[PDB]
Amino acid sequence: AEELVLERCDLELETNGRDHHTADLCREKLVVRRGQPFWLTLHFEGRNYEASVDSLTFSVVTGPAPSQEAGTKARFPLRDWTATVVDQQDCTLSLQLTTPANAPIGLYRLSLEASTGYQGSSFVLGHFILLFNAWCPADAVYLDSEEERQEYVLTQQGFIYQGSAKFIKNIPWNFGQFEDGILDICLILLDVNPKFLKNAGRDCSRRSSPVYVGRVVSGMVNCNDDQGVLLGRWDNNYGDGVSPMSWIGSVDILRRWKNHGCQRVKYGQCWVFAAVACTVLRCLGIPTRVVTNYNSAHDQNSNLLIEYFRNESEMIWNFHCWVESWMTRPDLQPGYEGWQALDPTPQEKSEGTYCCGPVPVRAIKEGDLSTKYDAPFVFAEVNADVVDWIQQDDGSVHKSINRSLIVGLKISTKSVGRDEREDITHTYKYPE
């Protein structure tokens, strides 16, 4: 028998997109979610596959230094990475492939080796992008509510709460995670992060974890310390850029960053950083929501007090925004799975860089402040006491609790499937 000759490999975009909840992403390239089967159809130019004669082996690789030990390379025969025949007709062979639910996310190249007992011939079948899979029970990001998966993964428009505890407002926001080119930009963001630049092979392996990815994104959304997206500015002078209040969605920001060679975009503030992080994380398939905290404290000396010095100082903000992302935490003691707070707005350094989280919101509520990452900082944002050091005419300083301004009020995120505000204060702090 002569060797097989491949005409083309059909990546079955329409069917895969629908099944994998990636239809908007699959206009031009295959995008699938890990842990779940997808279809491919091979078209042969002479004879078809014959099981008695042909042995077919598949190989997948991601990133610049793939290896089987790191999970960034796998080899598997047509019989966790698997391939099986589903149909055979004239010149075509219909296959189903499956990936592990813990596979590193990103761009893979898929190849085929074919043999009839002598020399093998190799073909590149194409590329696909593998994403987190909130529909898959074995995936760390599994979320067992369809209405919540719709909200926190698939919906591209939401609302962000702003203003003050006394005067709540909101703006609409276009997350736009499935608009053309955005996924490509998300992968660029991962591929220019400092951990990649330092050890690409390790970084690519570690992208199996939503914890690692979440932490990476919290750092890369701000331009501080790295090649990240946004420059913050707070002094009301935005003439040489875009005012933070002008943006209506994330896509203009991410396109601007890409188009100028990963140059910082001017300008953002909290809700801008949070919204862009939400876009990136929803895009990669991690269920994510934007949260607003009113009277949001910035503790500068980790003592869980907000200290003001007054006549005969740390700051509290009218509001602050960050994101929560849904995942298990196998890096912690059991019980901390669910919503994790991630904060891309530069405030305090974490191990020398401007990143923050992920921290289980549950750890914040229960005061388990040794729980990684950055639990004391986030605890103080929502539950610090305010102390006034008031100088007395006699020269002494009286320390008093100020109860006029309470830290951490009316914590808010958009309601699932409706244009209304959900109060989630109860998830961060017990009532007193």
């Binding site: 933070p244 903000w317 602050h320």
Partner: peptide
């Protein structure tokens, strides 16, 4: 904008 009280 975000404003420090």
């Amino acid at each position: 904008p975000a404003x420090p009280f």
